[PDB]
């Protein structure tokens, strides 16, 4: 919390001119970059230890005799999608795009089913790019 907080204060200590992201890319080709790099390194590493420790304590608590979170039969699929971590969301997206690519190759280059071809209309395609390209990983 304190390291990530200092990182937050560090990024808040960046003077912001009128937004010209060309200059933002120009900054690649300064001590500020190294110090933000170090602060992010500490914050992300500490997250890594925190995550392994949480996984370890969950494993130990389960081994003690306790049980993990149970999926109730009354659970709405949409709220548990909403109450799922974004990292879980990105990972499962990557897996299911792998699955969809497997289906596409599974057609062996033949006709893709027309159901998804009709499904990938203008608005759905636009919405998926609009939601992923701004925020998703490059991969």
């Amino acid at each position: 919390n304190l390291a990530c907080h200092r990182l937050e204060t560090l990024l808040q200590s960046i003077d912001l001119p009128p937004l010209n992201s060309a200059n933002n890319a120009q900054y690649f080709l300064v001590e500020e970059d190294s110090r933000v790099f170090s602060a992010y390194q500490d914050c992300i590493q500490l997250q890594l230890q925190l995550n392994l420790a949480h996984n370890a304590v969950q494993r130990l608590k389960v081994a003690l005799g306790a049980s993990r979170k149970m999926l109730s039969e009354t659970s709405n699929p949409e709220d548990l999608i909403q109450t799922s971590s974004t990292e879980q969301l990105r990972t499962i997206i990557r897996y299911l795009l792998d699955t969809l690519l497997s289906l596409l190759h599974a057609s062996n280059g033949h006709s893709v089913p027309a159901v998804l071809q009709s499904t990938f209309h203008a608005q759905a395609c636009e919405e998926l790019f609009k939601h992923l390209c701004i925020s998703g990983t490059p991969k």
């Binding site: 949409e78 499962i92 998703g136």
Partner: peptide, 22 residues
């Protein structure tokens, strides 16, 4: 079978795409 999994995953696509931006 290819149709059922495709439509189900498509529904998943829609849901997680509208959810991810949040």
């Amino acid at each position: 079978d290819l149709a059922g999994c495709s439509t189900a995953c498509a529904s998943l696509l829609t849901a997680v795409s509208r959810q991810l931006q949040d």
